[PDB]
UniProtKB/Swiss-Prot annotation, chain A:
Protein's gene: NTP3
Localization: Secreted; Parasitophorous vacuole
Subunit structure comment from the entry: Homotetramer.
Family: Belongs to the GDA1/CD39 NTPase family.
Function of the protein: May perform an important processing step in the conversion of high energy nucleotides prior to uptake by the parasite and may contribute to intracellular survival and virulence. NTPAse-I has a specific activity 4.5-fold higher than NTPAse-II in hydrolysis of ATP. The primary difference between these isozymes lies in their ability to hydrolyze nucleoside triphosphate versus diphosphate substrates. While NTPAse-II hydrolyzes ATP to ADP and ADP to AMP at almost the same rate, NTPAse-I hydrolyzes ADP to AMP at a much slower rate (0.7% of the rate for ATP).
Name of the featured protein: Nucleoside-triphosphatase 1
Length: 51, 51
């Protein structure tokens, strides 16, 4: 990769945020400290603990 | 040959699409499948030793 140039396609921006950040295929390890519930993604939170 | 008398039945029940346990964590379905207990396969096919 040499250069990054903007395309400004908000819908594709959403779909990528969705797959990279919000609901990744392989999320990083869940945090199990006292202050943490132990969830690994936003996707998992609202799918099992919605309020 | 009874499904009820198969030694794999409790592992097959854990490693199933029905079980929310394998739905919470993404890697769970893969950890099942790679140990020859495929949640995608129906119960009898899931416990069967091929060839």
């Amino acid at each position: 990769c040499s250069i990054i140039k903007g395309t400004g396609n908000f819908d594709k921006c959403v779909s990528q945020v969705e797959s990279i950040l919000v609901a990744p295929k392989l999320p990083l390890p869940a945090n199990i400290e006292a202050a943490s519930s132990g969830f690994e993604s936003v996707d998992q939170v609202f799918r099992f603990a919605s309020s | 040959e009874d499904v009820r008398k198969n030694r794999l039945k409790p592992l097959a029940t854990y490693c199933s699409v029905n079980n929310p346990e394998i739905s919470f964590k993404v890697t769970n379905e893969m950890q099942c499948r790679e140990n020859s207990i495929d949640p995608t396969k129906p119960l009898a096919e899931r416990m069967k030793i091929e060839n």
